[PDB]
Amino acid sequence: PIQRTPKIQVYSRHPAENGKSNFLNCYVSGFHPSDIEVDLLKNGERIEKVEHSDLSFSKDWSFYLLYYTEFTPTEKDEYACRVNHVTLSQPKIVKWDRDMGGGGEHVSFHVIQIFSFVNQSWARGQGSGWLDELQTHGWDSESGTIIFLHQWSKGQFSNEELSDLELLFRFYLFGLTREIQDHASYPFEVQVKAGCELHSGGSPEGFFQVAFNGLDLLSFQQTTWVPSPGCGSLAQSVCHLLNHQYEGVTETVYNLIRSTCPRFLLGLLDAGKMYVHRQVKPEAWLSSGPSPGPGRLQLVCHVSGFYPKPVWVMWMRGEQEQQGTQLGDILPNAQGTWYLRATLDVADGEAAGLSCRVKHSSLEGQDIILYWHH
């Protein structure tokens, strides 16, 4: 427990044009527990050879997953994202459709960990490193080794440092597992988010947060562990344990989270800048959306492939912003960049003369304008 339902978002990276190669993205989020089945379908057949990020979660602790593959839109062929979850009666198939528009400061670095305990002697585990919303690391479970997803994932650390880190992680895992395997009278899931935010001005902000069955359990605030008020005897127990019984583990954590993490983080940024990519022009295109009702249209404006994140997108009549404009979420793209789509609902007659306007930092001040037409 408890149960949350997956939001499902399907979208293409480029304008859809028959025979021309494209990328199909599927973003599955908001779910809990972590047990899930996601498949990209072509004409009902599951597509093998797809890319998927490792499992992560939000501040809410709900899980999310990115999927994508290469595909070609055609007149005949039908594509879908198929999801199966404990909160679904039947599997949900959401089609991708050109004419529906797809269907549906500070930097931070964190290590994310999910533990799934079905019983005493059976448990799943997985973890991964994330630079902002960008995964930079996986973790091989059998070997107990780090997986560096990119040419810069090492981030200006020597090999000795990272070896020591691997072993530190190994023993940390052995420790907690033994620790959770004790305390036995029972299905449950444990999530850990640990790492650092780096802020303008250089002040690091450390965090180590745990959750249980998707519930806020404990955290680490300024050299002292804190329980989230349940109460909460479990959290208070384990906190108290860490605070005193074995302190010195927290010396490591404290060091690791206030030092090494911001240094590694900065190392990633440095090594990252070499390859790509400072700024990227989006491309934009219009499509219809799902019909809002008889005698009404939904206009969809797609903005895809922009980086950095900040965008301004609006439906216009001349200089007048449209009141009804609805901005979707900013979603991740196949390799690194960003996707967003804005919709508007309008009567048939009032469709003509509406424009979608895009402002991005990389456009050099010359905005993208797209005019609706039939």
Ligand X SMILES: CCCCCCC[C@@H](C)CCC[C@H](C)CCC[C@H](C)CCC[C@H](C)CCC[C@@H](C)CCCOP(=O)(O)O
Ligand Y SMILES: *[C@@H]1O[C@H](CO)[C@@H](O[C@@H]2O[C@H](CO)[C@@H](O)[C@H](O)[C@H]2NC(C)=O)[C@H](O)[C@H]1NC(C)=O
Which residues are near ligand X by CB under 6 A? 111, 113, 125-129, 137, 139, 141, 146, 165, 169, 172-173, 175-176, 179, 194-195, 249, 252-253, 256-257, 260-261, 264
In 3D space, the residue among 218, 330, 307, 270 whose CA is nearest the CA of residue 109 turns out to be: 270
In the bound state with ligand Y, the residue whose beta carbon lies nearer, of 114 and 340, is 114
For the CB of residue 324, give the shortest distance to Cl ion in the complex, in Å.
Answer: 15
> Is there binding between residue 122 and ligand Y (CB under 6 A)?
yes
Classified as helix, coil or strand, 341 is strand
For the CB of residue 320, give the shortest distance to Cl ion in the complex, in Å.
Answer: 21
Among 86, 118, 352, 369, binds ligand Y (CB under 6 A): 118
> Is there binding between residue 185 and ligand Y (CB under 6 A)?
no
Q: Work out what residue 122 binds among Cl ion, ligand X, ligand Y, none; the CB cut-off runs from 5 to 8 Å by kind.
A: ligand Y
Q: In this chain, which stretch among 115-123, 199-207, 340-348, 366-374 interacts with ligand Y, using CB under 6 A?
A: 115-123
296, two tokens? 């009404």
Gap between the terminal Cα atoms of the chain: 49
Alpha-helical (H) ranges within the chain are: 159-181, 233-240, 249-258, 261-275
Among 116, 126, 145, 260, binds Cl ion (CB under 5 A): 260
For the CB of residue 212, give the shortest distance to ligand Y in the complex, in Å.
Answer: 19
Q: Work out what residue 276 binds among ligand X, ligand Y, Cl ion, none; the CB cut-off runs from 5 to 8 Å by kind.
A: none
73, two tokens? 């839109």
In the bound state with ligand X, the residue whose beta carbon lies nearer, of 93 and 134, is 134
Q: Scanning residues 230 to 289, which ones bind ligand Y (CB under 6 A)? A: none
Encoded amino acid at 262, one letter: P
Q: In this chain, which stretch among 33-41, 117-125, 188-196, 232-240 interacts with ligand Y, using CB under 6 A?
A: 117-125
Rounded to whole angstroms, how far apart are CA atoms 164 and 171?
11
Classified as helix, coil or strand, 164 is helix
Q: Work out what residue 119 binds among ligand Y, ligand X, Cl ion, none; the CB cut-off runs from 5 to 8 Å by kind.
A: ligand Y
For the CB of residue 184, give the shortest distance to ligand X in the complex, in Å.
Answer: 17
For the CB of residue 110, give the shortest distance to ligand X in the complex, in Å.
Answer: 7
| Residue 244 per-residue DSSP state | I
Q: Report long-range pairs for 212-219 (Cβ below 8 Å, ≥24 apart).
A: 212/188, 213/1, 213/2, 213/188, 213/189, 214/1, 214/2, 214/4, 214/32, 214/33, 214/61, 214/62, 214/189, 215/61, 216/61
For the CB of residue 37, give the shortest distance to ligand X in the complex, in Å.
Answer: 21
For the CB of residue 348, give the shortest distance to ligand X in the complex, in Å.
Answer: 52
Query: Based on the number of CB atoms within 10 Å of its own CB, is 157 exposed (0-12), middle (13-18) or buried (19 or more)?
Result: middle
> Is there binding between residue 86 and ligand Y (CB under 6 A)?
no
In 3D space, the residue among 102, 119, 79, 92 whose CA is nearest the CA of residue 36 turns out to be: 92
In the bound state with ligand X, the residue whose beta carbon lies nearer, of 253 and 280, is 253
- Residue 146 neighbours by CB distance under 10 Å: 20
Q: Work out what residue 305 binds among ligand X, ligand Y, Cl ion, none; the CB cut-off runs from 5 to 8 Å by kind.
A: none
The torsion angles phi and psi of 31, rounded to 5 degrees, stand at: -100, 165
Q: Work out what residue 232 binds among Cl ion, ligand Y, ligand X, none; the CB cut-off runs from 5 to 8 Å by kind.
A: none
Rounded to whole angstroms, how far apart are CA atoms 308 and 281?
10
Among 119, 158, 222, 245, binds ligand Y (CB under 6 A): 119
In the bound state with Cl ion, the residue whose beta carbon lies nearer, of 150 and 309, is 309
In 3D space, the residue among 301, 326, 343, 303 whose CA is nearest the CA of residue 13 turns out to be: 303
Binding interface with Cl ion (CB under 5 A): 49, 98, 259-260, 286, 308-309, 328
Binding interface with ligand Y (CB under 6 A): 118-119, 122
